[PDB]
Amino acid sequence: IRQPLGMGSYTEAAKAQGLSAGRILVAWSDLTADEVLAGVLGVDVGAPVLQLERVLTTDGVRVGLETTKLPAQRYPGLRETFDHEASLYAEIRSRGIAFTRTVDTIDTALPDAREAALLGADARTPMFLLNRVSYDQDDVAIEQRRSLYRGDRMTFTAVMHA
Amino acid sequence: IRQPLGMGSYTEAAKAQGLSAGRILVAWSDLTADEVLAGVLGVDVGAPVLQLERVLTTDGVRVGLETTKLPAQRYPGLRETFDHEASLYAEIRSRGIAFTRTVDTIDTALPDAREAALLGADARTPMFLLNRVSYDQDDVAIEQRRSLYRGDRMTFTAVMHA
């Protein structure tokens, strides 16, 4: 699977290029933001954080493990009502939030044993590790998202013009 | 090192940002183009191809292994005169050839023993495997470039706007 780097969800993007794709819940977790995460999200140190962790499939195989950290206060009732199998991105937009800017870091790493088990991967195999912070129309952070993608099932691409 | 994705050379980008950067020669090689590479460069099967392989350094340490395949006919005198410690991109521009469009694929990979030895890396370490074709102002191919970067030394970044 060859995926242009993009602002939109890659699950939705895979759906677009005419492929099957989906999301499998791993866990919701209630966290409180440490100094680092508080700074990233622009919330108080100790603020509630809602974490959604999912396995991502495409073309009926596992391709990624996505861990999204949300400032809980921005999202009343999300954990109670969100269909974790739907598009998180669309739900947030539905809440009057526009994905205005995204800052992505692209790393490469070996999965830990838990990540490797969730993805059906050999732990020796390198994975893409993407980390994203997205910002809304007022430049308030929406989410911090970590995506671990199987190196053998994903190629990212970029076309650039002078 | 955090490096924005971009069309410019990453070695030069590091120097533009105030870091030391440089290149070490591994080898120049005379190849002829087979069917796949003839296709990529827009040249005839058997056309001469000049390969430049260099180790790239930044902030004093080895960060990547670059293997650049050039249609030799486009660059008279390059092997014997080009200073391999200097910017190949700038030499190509000084010859009147503008980097106008790039097509990059971004993969993750483990190095082979030779690649690992040249990079001073453990062969269990994840690497970025980048492959690029660049095209000039007349959409004529300039090079095909394979870059293998140490995952523990490089992080790529992208910022995107709605």
Curated annotation (Swiss-Prot), chains A, B:
Any one GO MF annotation of this record: DNA binding
GO BP of this protein: negative regulation of DNA-templated transcription
Keywords, alphabetical: Cytoplasm, DNA-binding, Repressor, Transcription, Transcription regulation
An annotated GO cellular component: cytoplasm
Location of the protein in the cell: Cytoplasm
Induction record: By phosphate.
Predominant subcellular localization, coarse grouping: cytoplasm
Function: Represses the phnDCE operon, involved in the uptake of phosphate, under conditions of phosphate availability in the cell.
Listed name of the protein: HTH-type transcriptional repressor PhnF
Shown segment, full-protein numbering: 76 to 237 of 244
